[model samples]
Target: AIVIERPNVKWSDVAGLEGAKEALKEAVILPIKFPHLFTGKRTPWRGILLFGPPGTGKSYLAKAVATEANNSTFFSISSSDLVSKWLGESEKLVKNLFQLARENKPSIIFIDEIDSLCGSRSENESEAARRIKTEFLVQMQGVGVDNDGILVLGATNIPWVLDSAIRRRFEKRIYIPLPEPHARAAMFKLHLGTTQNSLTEADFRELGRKTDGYSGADISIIVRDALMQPVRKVQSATHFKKVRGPSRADPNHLVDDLLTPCSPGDPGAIEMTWMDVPGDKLLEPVVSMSDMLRSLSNTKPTVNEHDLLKLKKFTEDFGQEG
Candidate 1:
């Protein structure tokens, strides 16, 4: 069996969701660090629910938590992976998932987009979905009593859609919200890395402030767009140089030197002509803050106001504040 080790993602790597991170630390990190405290203790955290809008880094936080607890097995399952066409295949998958967890002690089972499988139920719900939800509920309840170091971590963008029973089964429900101003600034810097372009602290702070309603994923895309600015600039400059060349011969010669296209069909030494364009004719490469802003304007935030409001209410009602 080829067992691929879990990739390590430190807490610092996960931007935003400070509140959620705090809760995970308590539920996963604490138990791993101090196992004796919960050896025979009745009060033990069995599972945690990470709920928030899309692209808020809920799944990333779960990986970071597992990395913090060395030697922990990380089992990630998606709704599409478990839900099946067969009538009773989903329940079997759930049982097998728990069985694998049992075999792997100090294991963590992370279910992404869990709301798809355990959404609000109704009397007319499809038999397949209901069966899968029932299986999940049974597995969650079993975790509480087994004490085999099996932790069930669930993440969902639409927490309101989750079944009430499944929601309650997750003893701790944490909310992963968009990055705040401070966190956004740090995220921008981290993604920027060691680019040649210079960005002042004030510049980053302003950028962060502007991305008020942006999620961690949005910030990453914004930074990526910003980085491309420099490349675009260079390309523009190169193209200009080629177009402004004194003679077509010069440009053609440069292109020929760069790309010597040798073909049997060619007559003689293909004389330099406008037909061949030099690499220098491309645009100049340069990334700028304005480019970043323009990109951000074009790329809308993934989470909308309504989603934020719903998340806020959930945090207030059922979430734990760090």
Candidate 2:
């Protein structure tokens, strides 16, 4: 999709990958914010490649840059957007894409899963794909046009599969690793948002420790599943108890007869389905550590160990740790 609207992802919204953040700030933000500093022998990186396993926040990082660099016009497109079945239109599309970026000064063209559109060359590759790659290279190099205000940002899970020539143009290759423990802790807290939870500082740290193999997206899913646990409990509970709590309609108003799901042995417990509880008086239990743990147990990390090893090797070979 071609969106000029900001993705509105703040740097703080991104959990971690401090190295990548800093590099981006220097490469993208600094140049836009302080153009004067990038004079003389210094020049901003025209392209950057964010490479890592899926769901490690590579695209999120790009969006954050789009948001942070308020002056820039952001273009978010995927590989399929550039590739086409039409005989000679793919190259024209590539040329036009760069032309639009040039017209919109201080522009960011973020191509997600870039390898699908510009993979390594082979003798068997079709003429259409080869033409698109050639057009892309010429446009990126700005053969006849100046590329001063445009930046090319690409995200790929398979950095190794990209064409060597295309890869070389992306001078700054940053690897977005899985979140560290502290970063994971931040992500858990971030995804939790303002949801009423009984978790404390130590519990958050514990969650970080417990989710060593999980990515930021994985933690988000876990938190989402955990947030619904209280609702699930209410849906299936056989007993409820009257309690004094804030009114659902207005937090400032307190209600004395709020019905909360409780164990059969709880004080003044009444047997009823969720339908029996008044709409305004049904008080769901606050999210707790137990709920989070249960959700964590159900949602496993999507990235496998083999993929992690491959990414690690790629980083060692051609990328800087982010």
Candidate 3:
């Protein structure tokens, strides 16, 4: 709750998972934004669950939902926040949370890593855990109480371990998969943005192709690591050269003596250490294709085939693919 932000993530900011976006739009956005259209049998979903591999943008999608649902009050509840150190406080907290949601109509309560909070119940489980989960279930879908404007959105990496009763509360269970090649390419461009780079269209597609089975988070990390390659070169350079570049003080004016790290083979390169170069004058090279390649070579995909197969099985049995 302390880390809450007026999340600025937009729909377009999310590269792939178009199906999931559409599902959320139907369940969350369309219902609240245009209540008149839903005067008939159509009803907004009370709960929606997003299940996927780590770094596959499940939490990111929740932020996007928070951003898009501008009229709704967003309550970002991390797993631990619902539990209390005191015995009875946890259930009271759960009650108060639902009451607060009811007060703030058209509210979104997003619980991140929900499995940790509402996992399958066990006889050996601590009473505190059981009470909290039971309180949550009662507050969510208890009879004689209507959850009209409050939408409970849950995200989890392991959907199979979730309590079946808790799972049923979520009407829409969407499986967010790893990005495909086209989406991965878009992700590369999204992360790279307007930063100085030697990567071309072909290079981006090649990056997408090479990063098979990599999550969107993986691609982002690769881009981030590649971005640092220029700085690393500047730090380790044995030579510096003066080159003509725009004046920092006046962009319209040209300066002739801008010092930059360069290869030893450069015509005007002079022997120098990083310490010899002034901080303001040092110009690092643009991120090159080779830098991206090197970063890719070093970084491995976080999601493994075994985990992926488990996700696939879960999706087949109880969830819709996104």
- What lDDT is obtained when candidate 3 is compared to the true structure? 0.80
Residue range with the least summed lDDT across 10 consecutive positions in model 3: 80-89
lDDT of 1 by residue, 42-140 (tens): 556777888878877776788887778775778875675343463444567778888787887777888888877763345344766677787877877
Best by lDDT: 2
- Candidate 3 residues 6-103, lDDT tens each? 57788888888888899888877887789887766876677889888988878778878877887466677566434547343355766777777777
Q: Residues 170-268, candidate 2, lDDT per residue (tens digit)? A: 888877788899999888888999999999999999999999889888998999999998889999999999889997778899989989999998679
State TM-scores per candidate. Answer: 0.75, 0.85, 0.84
- Identify the runs in model 2 with alpha carbons over 4 angstroms from their true place: 7-10, 28-44, 67-70, 80-92, 119-127, 318-322
Please provide the root mean square deviation of candidate 3 (C-alpha atoms, Å).
3.9
After superposition, candidate 3 runs with Cα above 4 Å error: 1-10, 29-43, 67-70, 80-91, 119-124, 143-145, 319-322
lDDT (C-alpha, whole model) for all candidates? 0.70, 0.82, 0.80
Compare candidates 1 and 3 on lDDT and give the better one: 3
